[PDB]
């Protein structure tokens, strides 16, 4: 169905020629390079680099149109199909590439970044939809749970749902100490901004973290016992002592790492 994709772009080149930005000869060259990619993407042995190459090539076409718009039309934006179509189609290619190759975390990463940069053009709900599929496809990758948590605590500043993302991630990955650290770090960040706001409120006129500390030791110990033991329990009494000792050593380094976290927060006691 390569022709279907080729036909969807016909109104646009007609718009490019109608506005005078691109000559029929130049338009034909863009078409020929476009055609080669579409057959490449639809064929056998297609890889992600084909999607990246097409996205990079298509991005350049957008830049020339923008430059020529000011050079020839002398207009910031011409009200026609040309303005939002190259931008719309790039997202379509990202969907196909991410759909075609769900494994590559790298390709997903540009998709989020590309849509994030065009915040006005892509609603934050569309960024939400991408994350929901991504978290769903790779639930055990901690980096993505902290990813969407970071996006919205800064850009949107929704602590309730930023709490929710970590609250889900810890459900799937209770044994990774990194995820606990970020969810504690977020927790003290919420408290400090709340207290700083309270200080500002007066000028113009935490235990919860310690609880996250408590369980964080317990489950990390449990999982570390589950690992290093394999399928079965350890019969020898002595090893069970080293198993306990190894958790204690593993566990204390986890605790000591948090003692360093406390030092960063001056306001907290």
């Amino acid at each position: 169905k390569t022709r279907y994709y080729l036909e969807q772009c016909i109104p646009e080149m007609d718009d490019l020629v109608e506005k005078g930005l691109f000559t029929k000869n130049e338009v034909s060259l863009i078409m020929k390079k476009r055609t080669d990619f579409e057959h490449r993407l639809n064929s056998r042995g297609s890889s992600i680099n084909d999607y990246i190459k097409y996205i990079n090539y298509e991005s350049n076409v957008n830049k020339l149109r923008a430059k020529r718009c000011k050079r020839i039309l002398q207009v910031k934006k011409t009200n026609s199909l040309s303005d939002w179509s190259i931008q719309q189609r790039i997202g379509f290619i990202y969907q196909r590439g991410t759909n075609k190759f769900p494994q590559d975390l790298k390709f997903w990463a540009m998709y989020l970044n590309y849509m994030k940069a065009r915040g006005n053009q892509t609603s934050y709900k569309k960024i939400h939809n991408i994350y929901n599929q991504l978290l769903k496809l790779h639930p055990t990758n901690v980096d993505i749970w902290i990813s969407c948590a970071k996006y919205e605590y800064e850009v949107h500043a929704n602590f309730k749902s930023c709490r929710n993302i970590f609250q889900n991630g810890l459900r799937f990955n209770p044994d990774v100490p990194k995820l606990w650290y970020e969810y504690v770090k977020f927790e003290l960040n919420f408290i400090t901004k709340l207290i700083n706001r309270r200080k500002v409120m007066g000028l113009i006129n935490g235990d919860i973290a310690l609880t996250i500390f408590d369980v964080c030791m317990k489950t990390l110990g449990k999982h570390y016992i589950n690992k290093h033991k394999g399928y079965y329990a350890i019969s020898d009494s002595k090893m069970n002592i080293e198993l306990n000792k190894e958790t204690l050593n593993y566990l204390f380094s986890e605790s000591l790492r948090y003692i360093k976290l406390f030092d960063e927060f001056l306001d907290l006691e």
Binding site: M110, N113, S147, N189, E264, F265
Partner: peptide, 27 residues
């Protein structure tokens, strides 16, 4: 304001990532 910058920012790597056994002998 200077203190708010000192406060830690949650760190993430995805953005950095973005940029034959059965054969008898022959006599």
């Amino acid at each position: 304001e200077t203190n708010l910058k000192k406060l830690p920012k949650l760190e993430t790597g995805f953005d950095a990532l973005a940029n034959d056994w059965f054969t008898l002998p022959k006599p």
